Amino acid sequence: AIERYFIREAVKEMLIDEFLEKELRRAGYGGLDIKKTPLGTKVIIFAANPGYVIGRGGRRIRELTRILERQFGLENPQIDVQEIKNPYLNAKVQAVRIAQALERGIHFRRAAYAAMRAIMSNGARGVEIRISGKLTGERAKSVRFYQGYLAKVGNPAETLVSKGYAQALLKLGVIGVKVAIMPPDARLPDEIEIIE
Amino acid sequence: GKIRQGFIKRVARELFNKYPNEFTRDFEHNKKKVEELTNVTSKKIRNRIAGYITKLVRMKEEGK
Amino acid sequence: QKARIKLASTNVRSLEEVANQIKQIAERTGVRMSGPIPLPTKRIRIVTRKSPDGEGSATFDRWELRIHKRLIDIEADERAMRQIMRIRVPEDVTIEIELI
Amino acid sequence: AKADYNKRKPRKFGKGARRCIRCGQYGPIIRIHGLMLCRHCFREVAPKLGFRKYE
RNA sequence: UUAAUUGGAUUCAACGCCGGGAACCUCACCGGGGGCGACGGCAGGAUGAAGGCCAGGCUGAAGGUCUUGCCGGACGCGCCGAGAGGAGGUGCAUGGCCGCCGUCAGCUCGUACCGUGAGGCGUCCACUUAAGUGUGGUAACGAGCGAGACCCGCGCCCCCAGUUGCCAGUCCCUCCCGCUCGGGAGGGAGGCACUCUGGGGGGACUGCCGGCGAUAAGCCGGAGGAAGGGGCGGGCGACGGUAGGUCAGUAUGCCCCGAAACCCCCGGGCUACACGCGCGCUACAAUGGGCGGGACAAUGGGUGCCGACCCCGAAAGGGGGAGGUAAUCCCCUAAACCCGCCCUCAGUUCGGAUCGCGGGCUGCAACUCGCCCGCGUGAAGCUGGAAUCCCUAGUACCCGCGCGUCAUCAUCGCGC
RNA sequence: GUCGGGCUCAUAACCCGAA
Ligand SMILES: [Mg+2]
Ligand SMILES: [Mg+2]
Ligand SMILES: [Mg+2]
Ligand SMILES: [Mg+2]
Ligand SMILES: [Mg+2]
Ligand SMILES: [Mg+2]
Ligand SMILES: [Mg+2]
Ligand SMILES: [Mg+2]
Ligand SMILES: [Mg+2]
Ligand SMILES: [Mg+2]
Ligand SMILES: [Mg+2]
Ligand SMILES: [Mg+2]
Ligand SMILES: [Mg+2]
Ligand SMILES: [Mg+2]
Ligand SMILES: [Mg+2]
Ligand SMILES: [Mg+2]
Ligand SMILES: [Mg+2]
Ligand SMILES: [Mg+2]
Ligand SMILES: [Mg+2]
Ligand SMILES: [Mg+2]
Ligand SMILES: [Mg+2]
Ligand SMILES: [Mg+2]
Ligand SMILES: [Mg+2]
Ligand SMILES: [Mg+2]
Ligand SMILES: [Zn+2]
Numbered sequence: 001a002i003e004r005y006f007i008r009e010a011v012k013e014m015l016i017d018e019f020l021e022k023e024l025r026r027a028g029y030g031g032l033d034i035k036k037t038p039l040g041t042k043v044i045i046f047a048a049n050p051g052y053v054i055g056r057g058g059r060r061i062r063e064l065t066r067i068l069e070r071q072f073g074l075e076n077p078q079i080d081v082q083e084i085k086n087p088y089l090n091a092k093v094q095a096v097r098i099a100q101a102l103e104r105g106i107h108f109r110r111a112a113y114a115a116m117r118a119i120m121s122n123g124a125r126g127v128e129i130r131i132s133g134k135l136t137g138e139r140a141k142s143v144r145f146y147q148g149y150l151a152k153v154g155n156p157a158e159t160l161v162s163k164g165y166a167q168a169l170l171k172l173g174v175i176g177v178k179v180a181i182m183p184p185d186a187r188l189p190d191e192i193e194i195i196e
Numbered sequence: 197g198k199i200r201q202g203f204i205k206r207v208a209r210e211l212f213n214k215y216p217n218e219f220t221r222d223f224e225h226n227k228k229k230v231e232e233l234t235n236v237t238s239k240k241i242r243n244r245i246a247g248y249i250t251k252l253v254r255m256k257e258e259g260k
Numbered sequence: 261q262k263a264r265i266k267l268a269s270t271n272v273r274s275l276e277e278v279a280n281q282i283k284q285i286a287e288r289t290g291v292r293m294s295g296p297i298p299l300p301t302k303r304i305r306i307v308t309r310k311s312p313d314g315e316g317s318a319t320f321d322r323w324e325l326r327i328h329k330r331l332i333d334i335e336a337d338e339r340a341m342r343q344i345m346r347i348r349v350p351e352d353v354t355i356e357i358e359l360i
Numbered sequence: 361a362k363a364d365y366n367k368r369k370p371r372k373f374g375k376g377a378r379r380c381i382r383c384g385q386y387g388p389i390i391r392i393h394g395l396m397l398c399r400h401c402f403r404e405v406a407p408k409l410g411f412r413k414y415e
Numbered sequence: 416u417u418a419a420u421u422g423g424a425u426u427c428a429a430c431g432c433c434g435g436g437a438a439c440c441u442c443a444c445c446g447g448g449g450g451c452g453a454c455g456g457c458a459g460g461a462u463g464a465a466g467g468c469c470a471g472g473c474u475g476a477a478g479g480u481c482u483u484g485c486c487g488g489a490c491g492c493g494c495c496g497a498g499a500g501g502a503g504g505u506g507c508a509u510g511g512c513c514g515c516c517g518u519c520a521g522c523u524c525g526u527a528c529c530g531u532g533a534g535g536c537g538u539c540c541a542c543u544u545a546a547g548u549g550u551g552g553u554a555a556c557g558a559g560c561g562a563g564a565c566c567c568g569c570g571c572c573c574c575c576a577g578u579u580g581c582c583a584g585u586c587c588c589u590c591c592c593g594c595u596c597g598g599g600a601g602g603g604a605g606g607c608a609c610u611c612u613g614g615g616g617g618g619a620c621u622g623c624c625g626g627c628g629a630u631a632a633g634c635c636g637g638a639g640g641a642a643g644g645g646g647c648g649g650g651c652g653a654c655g656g657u658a659g660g661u662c663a664g665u666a667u668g669c670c671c672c673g674a675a676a677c678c679c680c681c682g683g684g685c686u687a688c689a690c691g692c693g694c695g696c697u698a699c700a701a702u703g704g705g706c707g708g709g710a711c712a713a714u715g716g717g718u719g720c721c722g723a724c725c726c727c728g729a730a731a732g733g734g735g736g737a738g739g740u741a742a743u744c745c746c747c748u749a750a751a752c753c754c755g756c757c758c759u760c761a762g763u764u765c766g767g768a769u770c771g772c773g774g775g776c777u778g779c780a781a782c783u784c785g786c787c788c789g790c791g792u793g794a795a796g797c798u799g800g801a802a803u804c805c806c807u808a809g810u811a812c813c814c815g816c817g818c819g820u821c822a823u824c825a826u827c828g829c830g831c
Numbered sequence: 832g833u834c835g836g837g838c839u840c841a842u843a844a845c846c847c848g849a850a
Contacts, residue, residue: 001717001718001740001741002268002302002327002354002740002741003302003304003327003393004393004394004740005354005740006270006325006327007304007393007394007395007409008394010408010409010410011381011395011409014405014408014409015381015382017408034351035351036351132509132510132511133509133510134508134509134668138508139507139508139658140508140509140510144654146559146560148559149559150559150560151560152560152561152652152653153560153561153562153565153651153652153653154563154564154565154566154650154651155565155566155650155651156564156565156566157565157651158565158566158651159565159566165511167510167511167666167667168510169666169667169668170668171668172508172509172668172669173508173509173510173667173668173669174509174510174511174666174667174668175509175510176509176510176511188564188565189238189241189564189565190201190203190563190564190565192203192207192234192235192236192241193234193235194207194210194211194214194233194234195232195233195234195235197543197544197545197546197548197549197633197634197644197645198544198621198633198644198645199543199544199546199548199549199563199632199633200549200632201548201563201564202549202563203564204564222622223620223622223623224622226622227620238564238565239617239618240564240619240620241564242620243619243620243622244620245620246620246622247619247620247621247622248620250620250622251621251622255630258630260630260631264578270410272614275614276614294576294577294578295575295576295577296576296614297576297577297578297579297580297612297613298576298612298613298614299578299579299580299612299613299742300580300611300612300613300742301612301613304392304393304411305715305830306390306392306402306406306411307818307819307828307829307830308390308399308402308403308434309399309433309434309513309828310403310512310513310514311433311512311513311514311660311661312400312433312511312512312513312660312661312664312665313423313424313432313433313512313513313514313660313661314423314424314429314432314433314434314435314660314661315423315424315428315429315432315433315513315514315659315660315661316428316432316513316514316515316659316660317428317514317515318432318434318514318828319513319514320828320829321403321406321413322413322414322415322649322650322829323402323406323411323412323413324411324412324413324414324567325409325410325411325412328613328614330613331578331579333578361467361468361478362449362450362451362466362479363450363451364450364679365448365449365450365479365678365679365680366450366451366678366679367678367679368440368678368679369439369440369679369680371439371440372719372822373440373719373778373821373822373823374439374440374441374822375437375440375441376439376440376441377440380664380665382664382665383664383665384664384665385664385665386440386441386442387434387435387441387664388433388434388435388664388820389820390819391819391820391821392818392819398664398665399434399664400512400664400665401664401665403512404511404512404665412566412567413567413650413651414566414567414568414649414650415566415567415568415648415649415650
């Protein structure tokens, strides 16, 4: 029946998104979108360095089209590569960037403060970052960085805040990175104004 | 406990001062006035604000 | 000589938009169109245990997916059928047209 | 033929005929409406599929 | 106890928990049998490496090995590195998730001020609140996260909409009754009234009245009202701690195995049984048991499927098969309850454990170790010591039903 | 005195049943 049709579409998109998440980690992957046309399927991919996805004049778009058509269930795909709309308001991108900075060898506090500075300058109401794992020794710990306005409990926190998570694999083990960001156009229920 | 909320009181005090000759001791009239003079979107919040404005009008008119 | 149009979506606004556009097309021409009939909403509820292990008090999540539906009847006239056949619904909407 | 002794028998029923499409686990598989996902995996991807916790 | 009876969890917060209802699989345990080393290089190899077979032995069964002799053409585990894979160790090396403290009212910040300093102040006092919820006073004045606001559903009213849902009034046709003045039942035309479905809107604000408190914050009692004082039921759990649980869901460091601790196949085991314990089911009967007759649901689910309707059979079941990708067809004419008759306080016409014989279904397989039906058989139990659990209204008690798991199997979980 | 169960985070004391 009809319910089975909607579930099949959702699962395939989730599998494709996860495969692209891991595959395009160096390109600053920032989501995808799929549109259905009478000739086939238009697949739009978002990234920071589209040259990496293109991969030195093709030889990689062909591979990805073959993967999409064979392994996954798209018929006659066509991949376009675009640019991220508001990268500093996307928690997932920032979590991946902080994780890569940690993998390079920067100290965790400096990386966290740099990311917060960029996010706040780019027009966000608030940001919260948490970093957990074996930071400075064999006994694990968690550290939290914060500034601005950020709702945490209730329906507004669910529908307004952008959330992201990433793992950073260092020589001693993994380090978890969590990011939350609230946009400039977010308005809480208790913020009323008088119509002048 | 029916303790009035802070932001309701703040906005009702702001509305009352700006238009002293706009709110009466009628709940329906004040409800329509709150509807026209703000961007409040919740029906519950509008009613709370209108009720507090009614109490303010009768408290100041009585002279406290 | 009548066509039956079936619509379904997870979003109420888009569904409403498509139905209103078809209604405007049926208004723009001399043709009777039975109003969009709302069929009962399909609900998919799944209940799961929250913990990965089996220690501690048992607690549960109740996840829900809602699929809304509409039904529209119109008389198959080509001057009116061309306008409706060229409409593009958003990708999150299923549309099916049949002739009865 | 030696590779014959590595190969699995293709069952059609039992716990061995169903694996999670995300992590490969046997066992607690949610079969509702054609999903094939473990209880563990369904919890963390349910929002991406469009499910919500209304109550 | 055993060849093995695989492992985790032990006060609340372990013990129908790990969605753990395991015949194979699952599987990690036990007995036995086979297979696997990308890439670098050593002996080697067309005078053919590695790999593959008709027949018959060994064998539980096997070109696995062997015998009998055929095949094919290029890499090379007889060797050293190296690697794949690992439900192997470590939750006291970690990430993520979850339980508890606790939906408790807490945790903090900027500047000022106090103390040599650790620190203090705000965050204290009175009254008030479900609430660090508020109103006044104050070396504090202000602010953030949590509370509340917010989101989903239930109960009343209006507008729009009329199919696959509804049938009151109206017209025709057919058949019944007390023979038709009157009363019923189908079918068709027709309609959207009513029920219902689902988009939008209204409605409740301590707003009105009288008291207490201060004339503040609020509290107590009345009207009107579908609804009255978070209206009712849910989702959402702050800074942290608990070396709480989980590497046996997935991710991951180190250590190990690496011709076996990796990968497959067959048969066993997780279902053992002097005994201690948790949570339940069925009873100990009349506030009942049996036999015939009569009533009224809701949630959900269906193409690897739900199956009306006809035929066959005493039953379980068997042979055909309309419609259904579903407001259309099906699961689907619930039980507790009501009427009449037998039994009359008894280990019984209470109870139905245990066992014999026979008939079925699913499955590759029913002994170990599955579920159903007919006849027979007829254990303990006659109300429960010391202790101890749940629940404040459509709640508790009592009664059945749907879905998950699922080829078959529900004394369970989640819902009606 | 023996054995078993209660109570306690647990042991002793204490309570109950039995041979
Ligand atoms: Mg709240
Ligand atoms: Mg055990
Ligand atoms: Mg079983
Ligand atoms: Mg087994
Ligand atoms: Mg721990
Ligand atoms: Mg505390
Ligand atoms: Mg000083
Ligand atoms: Mg203090
Ligand atoms: Mg405090
Ligand atoms: Mg003090
Ligand atoms: Mg507060
Ligand atoms: Mg409430
Ligand atoms: Mg521990
Ligand atoms: Mg413990
Ligand atoms: Mg067991
Ligand atoms: Mg009997
Ligand atoms: Mg009867
Ligand atoms: Mg007897
Ligand atoms: Mg027999
Ligand atoms: Mg048997
Ligand atoms: Mg006796
Ligand atoms: Mg008796
Ligand atoms: Mg169970
Ligand atoms: Mg003792
Ligand atoms: Zn899984």
